[PDB]
Structure 1
């Protein structure tokens, strides 16, 4: 299944967008455990196509056209949204990040790997079949569907290194899915950014938050499978939403100094005091 492709994009008019991003700031300020869920829509503003948008991989395949890239994976820069998520984690306003993206931009943005579940894998990550050690490379490993890459493990092993890109049939990495599930169940606030939530089980994790009494925010230009469950629904460009959110929180979007891998989150930095809400 390729799900429902080419659904129309909706745009909240300016006054409604500004009110909703203020509401998003309120939910972030008032929640103790925030989880973000990202899909291909947070990388479109860096020149990587989505799957089901108007120019998505599947949408364009139906017209017998190839998807259009404005960059390579290697030369892609993290978006304002990617860098906003880095800062929210650094000041302790983001507990966990669940991504369906294989574009490798969360990792290369400097987002700590111990707070990231990459449910569908990472173009730049190969894993040793023998000892399960991961290598984050500066270039895409070159295979998809958990095939041998031609390189061997160098741990003090010679194990066969395979890509981490799931094929259609393949089940999700157990560690990442277990952590994504635990994080989603424990969150009082799940925020989805640039995902249609059409792929199971990735797309249902934000519901785990709702089922347990937490709130759900969906940010997406197209409608999503779970629109009916959202406490707040924002139809706008994620970069515009996240830059306005960061201005309300009084946080800067940090500079990206090129590809940087952070295995373990650093201690939390200071953040502005919270406004008096109502």
Structure 2
């Protein structure tokens, strides 16, 4: 926990100039249009615009600890609103342009945004989710589960069991949830486009999953303010705020970003909603 490798913290941010950013976001739109199977990979950078600090950014949790300072939260986890980026991802799944979503985030925001749980891998856990040790039944709570490291919360299973409820928050030594990793790995390998949003890709195996898309000629897009571990393997790197990238992308795809009605849990994805006809590309 103390000796745990926290990776490269507080690397300088990169800002693509406006003409370059507009061009790269048009190229991302072209890639989404051309791809059969698009998989999104999200980390802490997609929640910074809701007041949750990241880990390895200039003011990240690990970066500030390294400098003897404290990360700053501008929200509780319960009061945090899904970002433009979170709601863009909801819409992209709804209209059938997102096959699967792989997240390292424990902030509960993809679930709370109404994103379907059967198309989401929560590789590091969810602070609002507790799981029965006996029957594996998950409970998605309206408040953060008060423990971390897969400890007993003090609550019991209510399935028609009285099993011990435990948090789903991995500690450093804990292996990833087998179901979530297996589905994330399958999605990434089968994808012809992986798009990374606000992750430095430094954690194994989470950070390596986007590389799996590159096997069999798949394309990799990295959207991140800082360098990432796998920048060399990216067909496209966009250095800008993930909300600016995603609002511009949605505008190019002819999609609105849906309203957030407050915390809502969706277990299963629906058939795709209607979406705009595709442009002629070549």
Range class of TM-score, shorter chain: over 0.9
- Residues 236-278 of structure 1: CA deviation (Å, up to 9, x unaligned): 0000000000000000000000000000012210000011112
Q: Distance in 2 between matches of 1:245 and 1:62?
A: 36
2:88 counterpart of 1:121: no
Shift of 1:213: 1.5
The 3-state SS of whatever aligns with 2:40 is strand
Shift of 1:64: 1.2
2:214 counterpart of 1:210: yes
Structure 1 match to 2:25:
21
Q: Distance in 2 between matches of 1:28 and 1:211?
A: 18
Q: Distance in 1 between matches of 2:216 and 2:67?
A: 42
Task: Count residues with an aligned counterpart.
Answer: 278
Q: Distance in 1 between matches of 2:71 and 2:241?
A: 20
Structure 1 alignment gaps of length 5 or more: none
Q: Distance in 1 between matches of 2:117 and 2:243?
A: 22
Structure 2 match to 1:95:
99
2:172 counterpart of 1:168: yes
Shift of 1:46: 0.3
Q: Distance in 1 between matches of 2:243 and 2:272?
A: 24
Shift of 1:199: 0.4
Shift of 1:63: 1.5
Shift of 1:212: 2.6
Q: Distance in 1 between matches of 2:66 and 2:199?
A: 20
Q: Distance in 1 between matches of 2:263 and 2:66?
A: 35
Using structure 1 for the length normalisation, give the TM-score. 1.00
Shift of 1:211: 2.1
Q: Distance in 2 between matches of 1:87 and 1:2?
A: 33
Q: Which runs of 4+ in 1 moved over 4 A?
A: none
- Residues 19-63 of structure 1: CA deviation (Å, up to 9, x unaligned): 000000000000000000000000000000000000000110011
Instruction: Name which of 6, 15, 20 aligns with 2:10.
Output: 6
Structure 2 match to 1:53:
57
Q: Distance in 2 between matches of 1:59 and 1:212?
A: 36
Q: Distance in 2 between matches of 1:268 and 1:242?
A: 20
Instruction: Name which of 230, 237, 240 aligns with 2:241.
Output: 237
The 3-state SS of whatever aligns with 1:29 is helix
Q: Distance in 2 between matches of 1:212 and 1:121?
A: 30
Using structure 2 for the length normalisation, give the TM-score. 0.98
Q: Distance in 1 between matches of 2:79 and 2:216?
A: 41
Q: Distance in 2 between matches of 1:263 and 1:35?
A: 19
Q: Distance in 2 between matches of 1:254 and 1:128?
A: 33
Shift of 1:119: 0.2
Structure 2 match to 1:225:
229
Q: Distance in 1 between matches of 2:216 and 2:104?
A: 22
Instruction: Name which of 98, 112, 129 aligns with 1:108.
Output: 112
- Residues 193-252 of structure 1: CA deviation (Å, up to 9, x unaligned): 000000000000000000232000000000001000000100000000000000000000
Q: Distance in 1 between matches of 2:65 and 2:174?
A: 22
Q: Distance in 2 between matches of 1:227 and 1:212?
A: 19
